């Protein structure tokens, strides 16, 4: 997917690593509802990409991902915990990486990473 600091690769195991690192409460006070709202924001563009057969991300999908970045910034502003979650998970940069790749495979990998984040947050 992408490369984190010190050569770390974005992965579902990396999602578990982030969840266990930020566990103390999670991500300095992150709740399940905020992460749920972020996953809901992911869901619409995920379904749009899933329905589309073309491997290359469609233009409306790319604009949806840009608006997803904007909404992530807004959520980070609204709640400091969401900002901490975003900066620890590097999801905002992952959206830009997906846009750069312009491939369905990278988008679904990022969606699976976010899904792993949600699953491990629920598990821990």
């Amino acid at each position: 997917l992408a490369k984190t600091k010190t050569g770390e690769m974005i992965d579902l195991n990396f999602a578990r690593k982030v969840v266990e690192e930020n566990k103390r409460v999670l991500f300095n006070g992150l709740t399940t509802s905020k992460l749920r709202n972020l996953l809901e924001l992911i869901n619409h563009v995920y379904t749009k990409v899933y329905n589309s057969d073309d491997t290359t991300l469609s233009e409306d999908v790319r604009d949806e991902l840009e608006y997803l970045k904007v909404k992530f910034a807004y959520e980070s502003g609204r709640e400091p915990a969401v900002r901490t979650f975003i900066e620890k998970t590097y999801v905002d940069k992952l959206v830009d990486v997906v846009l750069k790749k312009n491939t369905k495979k990278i988008f679904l990998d990022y969606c699976k990473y976010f899904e792993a984040l949600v699953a491990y947050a629920k598990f821990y």
């Binding site: 749920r36 996953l39 809901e40 992911i42 869901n43 995920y46 379904t47 899933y50 329905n51 057969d53 969606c111 699976k112 899904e115 949600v118 699953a119």
Partner: protein
Amino acid sequence: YSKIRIVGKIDVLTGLHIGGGGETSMIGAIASPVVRDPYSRLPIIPGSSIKGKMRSLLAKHIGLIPGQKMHNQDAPEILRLFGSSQKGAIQSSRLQISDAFFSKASQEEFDKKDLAYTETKFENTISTAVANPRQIERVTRGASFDFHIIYNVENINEVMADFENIKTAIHLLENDYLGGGGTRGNGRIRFVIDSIDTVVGDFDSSNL
């Protein structure tokens, strides 16, 4: 031996949902996906669903025998139309209802209007008043599927009765629902027949 073809379209009225059994789905999305044709990734009404629903509705309309246990115990006309597997009394199924693929006209209409072929209806289940979120993928209203039904003329004299039963079954299916979730509204559908033609044999389909 005459093969009579009934080609037409079937258009959803409230939203059809024939489930595919669940699949790899992101958390909170694609809870119960609709069955789709693997090749075109397009929603499809299986011929199995249409035939089974029509057979069951016809059986209810005619009247099930008391304490019926198997589908090979329906009315003789239903057994001659939809087939039978009874030991020693096997009856060939004259009706060969096939898969109702997504019509190209409706597919291009949806593409023109920038509408998804399937709507992910987000519903829940109140308990304590605790809900159970779920995303059921049901076919978008106004989607037409082309249905193709083969009728075999096993007995010429019985063709009129069999086609009257077919008309009654179509009327019931339009009146009743198709697929799953009918009591909640989703699954009501409508038939629009295009032409009944006898592709094979000397039988005349103009009267039919």
